Every structure is written in structure tokens, then in C-alpha cells.
mmCIF file of C-alpha atoms in Angstrom:
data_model
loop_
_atom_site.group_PDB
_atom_site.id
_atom_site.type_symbol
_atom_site.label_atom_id
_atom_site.label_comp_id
_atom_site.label_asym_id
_atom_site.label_seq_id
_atom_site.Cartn_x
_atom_site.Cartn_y
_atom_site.Cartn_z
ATOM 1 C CA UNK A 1 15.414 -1.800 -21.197
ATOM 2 C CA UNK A 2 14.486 -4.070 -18.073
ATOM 3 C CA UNK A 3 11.780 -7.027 -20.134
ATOM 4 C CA UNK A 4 10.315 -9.919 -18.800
ATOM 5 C CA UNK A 5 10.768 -8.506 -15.309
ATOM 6 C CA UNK A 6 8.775 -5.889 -17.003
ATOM 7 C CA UNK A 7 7.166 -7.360 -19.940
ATOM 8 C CA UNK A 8 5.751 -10.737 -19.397
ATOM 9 C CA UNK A 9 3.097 -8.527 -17.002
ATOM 10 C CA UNK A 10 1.864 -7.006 -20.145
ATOM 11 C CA UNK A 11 1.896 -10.345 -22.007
ATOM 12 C CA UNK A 12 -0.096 -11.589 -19.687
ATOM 13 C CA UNK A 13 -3.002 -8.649 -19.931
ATOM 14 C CA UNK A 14 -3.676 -9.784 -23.249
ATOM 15 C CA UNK A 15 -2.926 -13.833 -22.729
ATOM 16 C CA UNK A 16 -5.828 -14.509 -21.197
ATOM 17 C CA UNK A 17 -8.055 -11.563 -23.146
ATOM 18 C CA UNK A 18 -7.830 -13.988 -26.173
ATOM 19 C CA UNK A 19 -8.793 -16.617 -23.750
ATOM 20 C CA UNK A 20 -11.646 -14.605 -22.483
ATOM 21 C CA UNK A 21 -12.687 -17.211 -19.348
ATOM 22 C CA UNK A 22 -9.709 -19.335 -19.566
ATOM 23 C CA UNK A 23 -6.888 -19.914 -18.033
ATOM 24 C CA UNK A 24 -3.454 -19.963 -18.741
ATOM 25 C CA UNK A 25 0.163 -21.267 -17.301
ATOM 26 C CA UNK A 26 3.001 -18.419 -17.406
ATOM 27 C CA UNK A 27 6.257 -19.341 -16.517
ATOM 28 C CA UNK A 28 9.036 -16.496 -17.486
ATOM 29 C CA UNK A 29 12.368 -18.766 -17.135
ATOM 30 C CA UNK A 30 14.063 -20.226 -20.137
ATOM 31 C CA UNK B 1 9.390 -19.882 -24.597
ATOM 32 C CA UNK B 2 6.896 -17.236 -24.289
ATOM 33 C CA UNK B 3 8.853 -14.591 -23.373
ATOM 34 C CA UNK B 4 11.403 -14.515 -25.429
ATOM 35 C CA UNK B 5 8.588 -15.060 -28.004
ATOM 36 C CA UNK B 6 6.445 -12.731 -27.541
ATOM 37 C CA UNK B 7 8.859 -9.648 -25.377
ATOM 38 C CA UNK B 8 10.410 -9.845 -28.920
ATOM 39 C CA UNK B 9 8.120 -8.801 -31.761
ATOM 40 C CA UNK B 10 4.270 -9.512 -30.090
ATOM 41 C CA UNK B 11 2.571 -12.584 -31.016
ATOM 42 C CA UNK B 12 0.151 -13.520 -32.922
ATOM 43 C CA UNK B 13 -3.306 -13.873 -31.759
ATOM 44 C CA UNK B 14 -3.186 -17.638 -32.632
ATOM 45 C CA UNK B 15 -0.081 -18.223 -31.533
ATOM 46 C CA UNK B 16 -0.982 -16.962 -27.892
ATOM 47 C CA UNK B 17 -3.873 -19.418 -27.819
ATOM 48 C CA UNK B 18 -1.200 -22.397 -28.078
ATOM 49 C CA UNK B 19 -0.220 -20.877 -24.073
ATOM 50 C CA UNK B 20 -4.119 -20.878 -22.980
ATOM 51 C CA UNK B 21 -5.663 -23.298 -20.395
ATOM 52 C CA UNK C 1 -16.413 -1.306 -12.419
ATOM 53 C CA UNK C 2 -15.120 -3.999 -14.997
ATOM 54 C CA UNK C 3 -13.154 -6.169 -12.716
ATOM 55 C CA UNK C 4 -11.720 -9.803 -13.100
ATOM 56 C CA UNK C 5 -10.971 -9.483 -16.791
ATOM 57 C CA UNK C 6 -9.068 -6.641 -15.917
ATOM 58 C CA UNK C 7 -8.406 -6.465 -12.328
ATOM 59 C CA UNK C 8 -6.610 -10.215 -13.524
ATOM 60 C CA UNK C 9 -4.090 -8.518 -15.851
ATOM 61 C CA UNK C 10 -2.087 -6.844 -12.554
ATOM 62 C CA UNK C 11 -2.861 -9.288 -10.222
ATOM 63 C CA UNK C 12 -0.637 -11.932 -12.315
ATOM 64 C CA UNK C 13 1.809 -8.773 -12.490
ATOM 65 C CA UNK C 14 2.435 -9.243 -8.603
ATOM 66 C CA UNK C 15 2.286 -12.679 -8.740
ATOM 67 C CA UNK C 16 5.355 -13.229 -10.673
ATOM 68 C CA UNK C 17 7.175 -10.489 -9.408
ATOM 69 C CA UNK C 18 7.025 -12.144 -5.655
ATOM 70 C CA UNK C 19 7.810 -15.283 -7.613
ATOM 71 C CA UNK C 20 10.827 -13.525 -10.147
ATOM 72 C CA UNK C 21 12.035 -15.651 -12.192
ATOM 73 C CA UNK C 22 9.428 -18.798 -11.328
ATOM 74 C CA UNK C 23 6.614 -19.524 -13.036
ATOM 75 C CA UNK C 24 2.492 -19.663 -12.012
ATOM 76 C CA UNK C 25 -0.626 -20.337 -13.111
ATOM 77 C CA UNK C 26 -3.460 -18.078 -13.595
ATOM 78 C CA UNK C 27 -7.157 -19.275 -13.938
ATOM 79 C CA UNK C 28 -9.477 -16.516 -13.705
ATOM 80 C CA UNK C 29 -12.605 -18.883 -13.701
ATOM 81 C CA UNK C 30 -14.165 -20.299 -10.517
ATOM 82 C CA UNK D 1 -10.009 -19.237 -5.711
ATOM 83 C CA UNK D 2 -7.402 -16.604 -6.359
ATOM 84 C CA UNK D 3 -9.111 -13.811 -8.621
ATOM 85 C CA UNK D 4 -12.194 -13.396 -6.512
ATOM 86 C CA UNK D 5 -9.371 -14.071 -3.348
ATOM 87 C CA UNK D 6 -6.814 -11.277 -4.249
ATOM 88 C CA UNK D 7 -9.221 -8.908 -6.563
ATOM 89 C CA UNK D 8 -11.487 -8.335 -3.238
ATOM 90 C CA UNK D 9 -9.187 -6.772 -0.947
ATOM 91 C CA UNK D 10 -5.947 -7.689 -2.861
ATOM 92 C CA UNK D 11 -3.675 -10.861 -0.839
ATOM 93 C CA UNK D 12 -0.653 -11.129 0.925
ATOM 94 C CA UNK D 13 2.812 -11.599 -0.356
ATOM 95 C CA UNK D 14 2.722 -14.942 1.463
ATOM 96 C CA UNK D 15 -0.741 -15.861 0.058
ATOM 97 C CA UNK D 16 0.667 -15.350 -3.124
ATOM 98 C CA UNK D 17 3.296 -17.647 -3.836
ATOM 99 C CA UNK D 18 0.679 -20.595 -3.035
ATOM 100 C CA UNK D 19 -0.010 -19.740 -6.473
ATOM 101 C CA UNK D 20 4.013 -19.817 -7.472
ATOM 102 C CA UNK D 21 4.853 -22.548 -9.820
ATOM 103 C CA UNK E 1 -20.863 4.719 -26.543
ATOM 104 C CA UNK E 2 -17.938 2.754 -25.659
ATOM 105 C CA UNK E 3 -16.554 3.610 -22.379
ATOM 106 C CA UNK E 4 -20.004 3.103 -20.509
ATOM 107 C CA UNK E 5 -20.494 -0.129 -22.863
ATOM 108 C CA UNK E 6 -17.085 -1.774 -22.305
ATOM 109 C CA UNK E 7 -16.045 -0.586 -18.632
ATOM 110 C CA UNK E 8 -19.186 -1.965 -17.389
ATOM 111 C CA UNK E 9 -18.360 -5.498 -18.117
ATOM 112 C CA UNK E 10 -16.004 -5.401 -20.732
ATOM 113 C CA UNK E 11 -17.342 -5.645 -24.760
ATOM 114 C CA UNK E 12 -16.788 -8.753 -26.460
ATOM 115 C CA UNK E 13 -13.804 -8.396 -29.204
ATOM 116 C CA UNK E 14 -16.026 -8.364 -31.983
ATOM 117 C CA UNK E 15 -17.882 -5.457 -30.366
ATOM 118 C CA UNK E 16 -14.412 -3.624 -30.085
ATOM 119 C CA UNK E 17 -13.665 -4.077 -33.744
ATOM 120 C CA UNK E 18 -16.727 -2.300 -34.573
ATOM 121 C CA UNK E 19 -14.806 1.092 -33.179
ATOM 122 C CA UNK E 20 -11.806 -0.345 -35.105
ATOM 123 C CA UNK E 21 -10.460 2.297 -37.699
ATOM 124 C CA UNK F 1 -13.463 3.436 -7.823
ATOM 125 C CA UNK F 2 -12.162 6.562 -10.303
ATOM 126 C CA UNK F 3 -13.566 4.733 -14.030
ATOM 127 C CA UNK F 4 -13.725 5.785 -17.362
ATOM 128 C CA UNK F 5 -10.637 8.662 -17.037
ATOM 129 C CA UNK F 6 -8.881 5.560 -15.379
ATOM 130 C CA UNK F 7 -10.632 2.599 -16.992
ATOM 131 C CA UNK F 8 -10.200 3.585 -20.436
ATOM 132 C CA UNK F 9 -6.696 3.951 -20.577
ATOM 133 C CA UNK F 10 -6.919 -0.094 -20.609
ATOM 134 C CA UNK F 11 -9.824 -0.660 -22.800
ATOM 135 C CA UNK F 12 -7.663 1.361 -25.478
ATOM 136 C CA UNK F 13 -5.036 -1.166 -24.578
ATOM 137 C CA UNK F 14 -7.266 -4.148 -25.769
ATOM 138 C CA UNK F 15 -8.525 -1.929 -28.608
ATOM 139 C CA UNK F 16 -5.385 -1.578 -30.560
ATOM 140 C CA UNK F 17 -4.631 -5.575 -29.534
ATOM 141 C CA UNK F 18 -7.494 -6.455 -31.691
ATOM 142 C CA UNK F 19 -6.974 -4.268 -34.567
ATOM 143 C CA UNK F 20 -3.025 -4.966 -34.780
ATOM 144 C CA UNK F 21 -1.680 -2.435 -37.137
ATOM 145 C CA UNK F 22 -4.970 -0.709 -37.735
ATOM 146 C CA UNK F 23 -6.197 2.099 -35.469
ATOM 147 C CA UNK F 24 -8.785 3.529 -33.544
ATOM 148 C CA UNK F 25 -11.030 6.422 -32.112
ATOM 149 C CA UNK F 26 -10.938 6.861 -28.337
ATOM 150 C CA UNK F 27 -13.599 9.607 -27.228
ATOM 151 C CA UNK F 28 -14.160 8.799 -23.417
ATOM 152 C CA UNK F 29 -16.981 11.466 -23.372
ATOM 153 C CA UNK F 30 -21.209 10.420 -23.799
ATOM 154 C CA UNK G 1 12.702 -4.774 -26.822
ATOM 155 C CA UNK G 2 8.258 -5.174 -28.620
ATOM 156 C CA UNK G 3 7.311 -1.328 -28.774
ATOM 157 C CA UNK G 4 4.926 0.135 -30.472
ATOM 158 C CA UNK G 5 1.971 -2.860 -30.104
ATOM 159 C CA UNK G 6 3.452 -2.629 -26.265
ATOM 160 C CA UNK G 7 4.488 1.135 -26.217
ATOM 161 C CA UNK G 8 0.892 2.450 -27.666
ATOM 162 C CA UNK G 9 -0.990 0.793 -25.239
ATOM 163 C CA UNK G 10 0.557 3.288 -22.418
ATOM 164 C CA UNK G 11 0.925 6.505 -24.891
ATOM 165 C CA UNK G 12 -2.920 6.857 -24.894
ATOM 166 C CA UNK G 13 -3.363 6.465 -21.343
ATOM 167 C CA UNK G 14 -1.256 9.933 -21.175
ATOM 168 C CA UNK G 15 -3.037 10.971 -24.398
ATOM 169 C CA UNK G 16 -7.078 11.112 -22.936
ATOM 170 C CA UNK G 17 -5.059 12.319 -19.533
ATOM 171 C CA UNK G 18 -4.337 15.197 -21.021
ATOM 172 C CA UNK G 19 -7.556 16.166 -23.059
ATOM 173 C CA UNK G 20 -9.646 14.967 -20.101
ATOM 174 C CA UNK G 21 -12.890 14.524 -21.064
ATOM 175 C CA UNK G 22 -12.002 14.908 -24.695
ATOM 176 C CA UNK G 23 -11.214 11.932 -27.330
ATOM 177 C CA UNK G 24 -8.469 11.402 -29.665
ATOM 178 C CA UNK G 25 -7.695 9.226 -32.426
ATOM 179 C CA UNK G 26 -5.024 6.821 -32.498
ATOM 180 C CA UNK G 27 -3.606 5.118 -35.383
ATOM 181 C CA UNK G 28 -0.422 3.069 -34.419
ATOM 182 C CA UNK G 29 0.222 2.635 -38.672
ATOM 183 C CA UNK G 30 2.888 4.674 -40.272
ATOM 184 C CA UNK H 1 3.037 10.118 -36.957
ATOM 185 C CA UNK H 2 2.802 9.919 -33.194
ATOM 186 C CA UNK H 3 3.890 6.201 -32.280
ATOM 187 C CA UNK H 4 7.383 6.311 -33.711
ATOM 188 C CA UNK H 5 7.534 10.152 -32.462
ATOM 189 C CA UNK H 6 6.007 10.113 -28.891
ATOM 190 C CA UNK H 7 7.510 5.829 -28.454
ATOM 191 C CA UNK H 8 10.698 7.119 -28.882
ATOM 192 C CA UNK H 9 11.615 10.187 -26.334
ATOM 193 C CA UNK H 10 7.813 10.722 -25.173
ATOM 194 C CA UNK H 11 6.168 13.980 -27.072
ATOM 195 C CA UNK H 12 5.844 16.981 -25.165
ATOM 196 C CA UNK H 13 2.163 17.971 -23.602
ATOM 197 C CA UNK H 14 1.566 20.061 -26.558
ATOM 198 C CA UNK H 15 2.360 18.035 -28.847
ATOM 199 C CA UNK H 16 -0.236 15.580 -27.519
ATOM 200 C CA UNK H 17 -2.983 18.017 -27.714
ATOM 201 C CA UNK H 18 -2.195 18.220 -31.656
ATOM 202 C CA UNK H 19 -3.482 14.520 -31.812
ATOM 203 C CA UNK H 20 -6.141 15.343 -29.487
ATOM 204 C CA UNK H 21 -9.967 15.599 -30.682
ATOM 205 C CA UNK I 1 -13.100 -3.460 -6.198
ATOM 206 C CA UNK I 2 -9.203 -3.484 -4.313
ATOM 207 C CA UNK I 3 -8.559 0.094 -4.741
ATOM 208 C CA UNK I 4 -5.240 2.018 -3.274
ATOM 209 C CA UNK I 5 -3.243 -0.731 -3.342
ATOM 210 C CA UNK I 6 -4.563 -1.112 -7.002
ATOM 211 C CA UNK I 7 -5.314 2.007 -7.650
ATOM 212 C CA UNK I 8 -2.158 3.969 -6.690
ATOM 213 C CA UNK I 9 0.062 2.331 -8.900
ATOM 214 C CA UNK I 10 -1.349 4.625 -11.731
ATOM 215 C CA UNK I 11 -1.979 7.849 -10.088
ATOM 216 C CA UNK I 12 1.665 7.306 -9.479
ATOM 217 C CA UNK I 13 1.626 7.516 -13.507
ATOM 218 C CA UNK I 14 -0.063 10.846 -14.088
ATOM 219 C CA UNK I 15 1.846 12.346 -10.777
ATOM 220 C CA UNK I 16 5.239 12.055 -12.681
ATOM 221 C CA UNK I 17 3.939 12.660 -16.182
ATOM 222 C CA UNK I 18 2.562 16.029 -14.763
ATOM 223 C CA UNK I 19 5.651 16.883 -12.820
ATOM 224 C CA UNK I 20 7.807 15.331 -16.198
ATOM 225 C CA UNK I 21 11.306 15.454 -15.181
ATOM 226 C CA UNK I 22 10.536 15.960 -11.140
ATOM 227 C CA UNK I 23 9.786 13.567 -8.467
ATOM 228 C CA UNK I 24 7.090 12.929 -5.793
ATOM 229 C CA UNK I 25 6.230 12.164 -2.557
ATOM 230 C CA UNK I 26 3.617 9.047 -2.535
ATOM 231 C CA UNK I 27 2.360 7.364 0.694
ATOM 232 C CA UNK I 28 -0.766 5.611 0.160
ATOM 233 C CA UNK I 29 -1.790 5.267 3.715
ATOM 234 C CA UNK I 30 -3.886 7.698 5.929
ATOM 235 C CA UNK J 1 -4.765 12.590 1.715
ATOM 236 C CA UNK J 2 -3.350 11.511 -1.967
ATOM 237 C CA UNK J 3 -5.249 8.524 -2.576
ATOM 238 C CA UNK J 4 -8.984 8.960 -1.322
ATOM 239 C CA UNK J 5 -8.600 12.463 -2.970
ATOM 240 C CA UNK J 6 -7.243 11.034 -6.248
ATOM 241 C CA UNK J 7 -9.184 7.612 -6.592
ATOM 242 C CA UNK J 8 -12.288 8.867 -5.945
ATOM 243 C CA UNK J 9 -12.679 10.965 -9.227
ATOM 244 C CA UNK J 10 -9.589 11.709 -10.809
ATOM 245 C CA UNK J 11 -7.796 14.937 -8.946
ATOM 246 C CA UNK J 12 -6.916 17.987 -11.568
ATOM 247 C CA UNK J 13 -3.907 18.619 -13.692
ATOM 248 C CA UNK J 14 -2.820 21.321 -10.533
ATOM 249 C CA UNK J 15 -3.916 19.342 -7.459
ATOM 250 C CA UNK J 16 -1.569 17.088 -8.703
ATOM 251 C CA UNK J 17 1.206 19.661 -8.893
ATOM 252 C CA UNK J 18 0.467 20.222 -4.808
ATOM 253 C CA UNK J 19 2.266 16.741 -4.485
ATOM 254 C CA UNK J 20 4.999 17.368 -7.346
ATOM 255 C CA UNK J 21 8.462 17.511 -5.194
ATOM 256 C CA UNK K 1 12.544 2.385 -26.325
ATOM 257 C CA UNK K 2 11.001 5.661 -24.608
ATOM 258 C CA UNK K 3 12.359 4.587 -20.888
ATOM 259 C CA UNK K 4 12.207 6.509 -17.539
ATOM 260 C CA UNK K 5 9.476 8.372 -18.196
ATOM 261 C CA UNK K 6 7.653 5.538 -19.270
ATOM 262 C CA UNK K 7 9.499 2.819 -17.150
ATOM 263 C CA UNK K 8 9.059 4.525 -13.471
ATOM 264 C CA UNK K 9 5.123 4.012 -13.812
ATOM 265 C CA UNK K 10 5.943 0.589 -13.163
ATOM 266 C CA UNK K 11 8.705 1.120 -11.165
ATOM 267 C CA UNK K 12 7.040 2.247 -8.737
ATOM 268 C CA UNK K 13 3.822 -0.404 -8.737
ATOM 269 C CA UNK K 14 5.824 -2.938 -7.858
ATOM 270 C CA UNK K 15 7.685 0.038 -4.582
ATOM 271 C CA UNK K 16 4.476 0.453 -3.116
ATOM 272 C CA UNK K 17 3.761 -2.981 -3.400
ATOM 273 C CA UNK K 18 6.270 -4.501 -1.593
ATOM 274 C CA UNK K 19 6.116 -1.479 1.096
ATOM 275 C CA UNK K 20 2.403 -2.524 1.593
ATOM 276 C CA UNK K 21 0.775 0.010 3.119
ATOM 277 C CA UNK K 22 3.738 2.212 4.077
ATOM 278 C CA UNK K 23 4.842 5.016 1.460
ATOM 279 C CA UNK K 24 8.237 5.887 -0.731
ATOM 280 C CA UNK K 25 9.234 8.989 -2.325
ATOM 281 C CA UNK K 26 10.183 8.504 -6.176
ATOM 282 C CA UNK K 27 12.406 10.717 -8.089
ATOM 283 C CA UNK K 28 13.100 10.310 -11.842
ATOM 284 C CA UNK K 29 15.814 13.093 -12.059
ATOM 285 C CA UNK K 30 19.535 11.547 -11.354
ATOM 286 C CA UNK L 1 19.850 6.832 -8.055
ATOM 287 C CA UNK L 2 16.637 4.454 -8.155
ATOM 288 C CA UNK L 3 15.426 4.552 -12.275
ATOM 289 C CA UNK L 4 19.095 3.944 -13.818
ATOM 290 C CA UNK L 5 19.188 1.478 -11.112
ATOM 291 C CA UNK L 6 15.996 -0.423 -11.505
ATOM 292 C CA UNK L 7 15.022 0.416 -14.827
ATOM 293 C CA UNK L 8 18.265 -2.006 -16.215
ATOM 294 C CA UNK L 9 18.013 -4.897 -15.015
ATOM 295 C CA UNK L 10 15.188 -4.701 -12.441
ATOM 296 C CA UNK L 11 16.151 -4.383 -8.790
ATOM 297 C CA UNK L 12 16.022 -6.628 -6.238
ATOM 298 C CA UNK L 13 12.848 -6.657 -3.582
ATOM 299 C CA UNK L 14 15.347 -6.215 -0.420
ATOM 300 C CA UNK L 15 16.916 -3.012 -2.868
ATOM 301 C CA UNK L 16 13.830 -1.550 -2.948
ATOM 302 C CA UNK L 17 13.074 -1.197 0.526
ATOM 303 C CA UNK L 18 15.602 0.848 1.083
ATOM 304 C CA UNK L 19 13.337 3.560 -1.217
ATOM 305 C CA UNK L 20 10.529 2.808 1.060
ATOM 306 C CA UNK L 21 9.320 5.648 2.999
#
């Protein structure tokens, strides 16, 4: 069940689809 | 955060725009 | 040959993966 | 600056974490 | 129809609904 | 630079994103 | 554990592999 | 349908053709 | 257009789909 | 080899087998 | 939570990406 | 062997050389 390793690089994908052009900041750490 | 926000039932399209540049 | 918007989504999957648990910034927009 | 950089020819581990937070 | 239309340089999400069930 | 049988397997992925619960029909073929 | 709006995306990506050229139709809605 | 039955041991080959077109 | 090093990491995807419980030999390099 | 063959246009359900272990 | 089959695919982006342009052999079958 | 053992808890980049060819 490995996430956020694994998952936040599918979050991403559609992160900055909604922002099209945009950009956004990820940061996976609590 | 995010993570544990979204890695735990999706987002919402809105909600997702709160992260964008 | 659609890149960017989604060559993007698995560049950022790299990019945190070298960085693990750190965070970064992704700005697909010159 | 780092699409157009790494989507081209993809860039190096090192080259990478200049983009780390 | 829609692969030629949005791997070319990607549809715009209001063009995607329009294949939307 | 292997499209369409490669590239649609990610415009699906947006696809469903947009419609949320609803669904779709994927015919990669002109 | 976000399946489903997450697991989809990747189940049609074997889907079209496996009819090819052909389409399908996918509906991610009990 | 097919999320909840290939999302939860992956389907078989065949049983992906029966959702293809 | 970064191919291979892109491009791999889902041919990889449909080599053990096909092969379903078997492995695989992959060596992206000439 | 793999790659040029594959990512050029898509190898078939059995050339992939030829790699299967 | 469809895992291994599904999870590898990734597994193995991130193998040949920190093997560069060197190979790996993967083997989903303990 | 190398899924059980990366598919868990993710593996770490100097554990998965040793699966490099």
C-alpha cells in the first residue's frame, strides 16, 4: 500500500491540469 | 496537508486550486 | 506529441522521488 | 527553466534537486 | 475525434466534457 | 514517439478527472 | 489508500492495450 | 461493474475484452 | 520529446501485464 | 533492441512475450 | 487496493531511473 | 524479493541498485 512515495506523483498529474499554465508548490512532509 | 488530503479520498476540484501558483 | 502538460506530470514524479520526503516547486510556464 | 530543461532530453539527478525545496 | 484532437496539444476541459458520459 | 496507443492511456486519465463519478467513451480509433 | 478516481485512471490504460485499436467504455459509477 | 471488480485483484484479459467495444 | 528514459517506464507496464505473474528482462540502453 | 523496437510504434501482444522471462 | 500487478509499473520507473541508462531485470513472482 | 519489498513502504534509492542490471 506504499502512498505518497507513490501517490503524491499522481496528485500532482492532475494539480496543475486544473491549473492549466500555472504553477504549483508540492511538498509531501507533514 | 495535501497528501494526507488528497492520498485519502481525492479532492475536490476547488479544493486543489487552494495548492495552485 | 502533447508534451509539457503532460510530459510535466512525471517529471515532478522524479523530482520528488530524488528529493523523498522534501518538498519542490513546479512551474510549468516560462 | 525546468520543463523545457528536463522535458528535452530529461536532467540529471544532480540538476534536479536545484529544484528541491 | 478525440485522440488526434487532444494528444496534439491537449483539449481544453470543457472540450473533454463534451465526450463525458 | 509511440502516441495515441501510449498517449491515450493519459488523456483517459484526465477524462474521468473531469467527469468525477460520471463516465466515459474511449475509442482511440479515427 | 484513494482508489477508484486513482485506480481507474491505470485500469484503462490496460483496457485499450488489450483491444488495440478498438475503444471501450468506461463508467467508474456503480 | 468493472472498477470495484478489476480495482480490486485486476480482471483477467478476458474479462477485459467483455468491456471492450 | 525525452523518450526511453520516459518512455520505458510504461512499456515496462504492458511487458508485465502481458507476462501477468512472470518477470522480465529490461535494459533500455543499446 | 527493446526500446527503439517498442517506442517507435507500439511492439505486438507476442513480441512482447520474446522478452517475458 | 489491486497491488503488485498494478504497483510494479511504478516500481520499476523509478529502477530504471536511478540506474540511468544501465538496465535491471524485474520479477513480480516471490 | 523486490515487490513485497518495495511495494510497502517504498525502498530506499541505494536498495534499489542492488536490482540494477
Amino acid at each position: 500500500f506504499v502512498n505518497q512515495h507513490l501517490c503524491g506523483s499522481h496528485l500532482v498529474e492532475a494539480l496543475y491540469l486544473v491549473c492549466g499554465e500555472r504553477g504549483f508548490f508540492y511538498t509531501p512532509k507533514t | 496537508g495535501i497528501v494526507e488530503q488528497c492520498c485519502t479520498s481525492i479532492c475536490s476540484l476547488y479544493q486543489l486550486e487552494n495548492y495552485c501558483n
